[PDB]
Design a binder for this molecule. Structure first.
Ligand code: CL
Ligand code: CL
Lengths: 187, 187
């Protein structure tokens, strides 16, 4: 049975960190829902790429649960994720059901805002470290991808393929991840 | 004065190969126009990411010329590029004015279709090699990025950062490219 991913897309998201995981997960046969935080309307990303979500977050929530909830980064997108009561509820539920949560660059700082996964090892974008580490609630890692159980984090646009393939491996296994990787022409 | 890039976006384009160059070029201070081949409406990419173009190709053409014309890949997107009389004219004009043309994965096969850049060294996605090489009009390279003068080619989603940074270097220079690269957290 196909695994399912919820990608939460907010204004100011890093569009590479949104599209690379969506695309790679779809390549892996994951059913991905790109859900707009603000509603069904197009989303203006950090570098002005405009992406049309598959559904509003409100609607996508009623179609869960999901095998992974994915938080792209970009500072302004991550702040919108961090400010959202809807995101808080989705992440709390996901953590309560022992489901994977994956966040990249500034995205992990929404985990802090929502009090998710304290006591985990995490990475972030280097520039987001101090924000993430306020209070000492996580242990910091400089690995390009960090996975501490059900909290999977990564650093930036240039780690997005590694992030996405780590999600694929966690859901669908190593062999699927390797099969998906080869046609991408990664170094 | 800011350099300008035209990114031609067709149905079935590889969305990573579209978004990574747009984003990286904008990071470099390039004025990028995402132009929809079919018009102004949203474009459904190969892995179902839906991108809203900045303008129709028809409108974007009247705002040229551009310092680079960029052709994303994806087989179906590249075929739509290859079938377009509008793309033929834009590429012919660009070649005639000695402007850069950049194409990735299947994208270079639109250069073949439009008879652009014959006698150049090129790369493509490995699966697109035989199509590109029909007739022997180019010399094939397995470099991740190939640049033979004003024809700049690359291989796949996993070479898109290298492709984009090569465009940045060609337009804005090595130092800008290095400055843009560092915050991306590339390996
Ligand atoms: Cl950002
Ligand atoms: Cl493709």
């Amino acid at each position: 049975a196909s695994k399912r991913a919820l990608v939460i897309l907010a204004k100011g998201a890093e569009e590479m960190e949104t599209v690379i995981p969506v695309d790679v997960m779809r390549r892996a046969g994951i059913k991905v829902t790109v859900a707009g935080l603000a509603g069904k309307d197009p989303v203006q990303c950090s570098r002005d790429v405009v992406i049309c979500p598959d559904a509003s977050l409100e609607d996508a929530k009623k179609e869960g649960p999901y095998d992974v909830v994915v938080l792209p980064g970009g500072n302004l997108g991550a702040q919108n994720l961090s400010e959202s009561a809807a995101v808080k509820e989705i992440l709390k539920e996901q953590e309560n059901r022992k489901g994977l949560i994956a966040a990249i660059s500034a995205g992990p700082t929404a985990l802090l805002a929502h009090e998710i996964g304290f006591g985990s090892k995490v990475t972030t974008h280097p520039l987001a470290k101090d924000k993430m580490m306020n209070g000492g609630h996580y242990t910091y890692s400089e690995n390009r991808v960090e996975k501490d159980g059900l909290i999977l984090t990564s650093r930036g646009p240039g780690t997005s393929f590694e992030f996405a393939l780590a999600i694929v491996e966690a859901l669908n296994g190593k062999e699927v991840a390797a099969q998906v990787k080869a046609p991408l022409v990664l170094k």
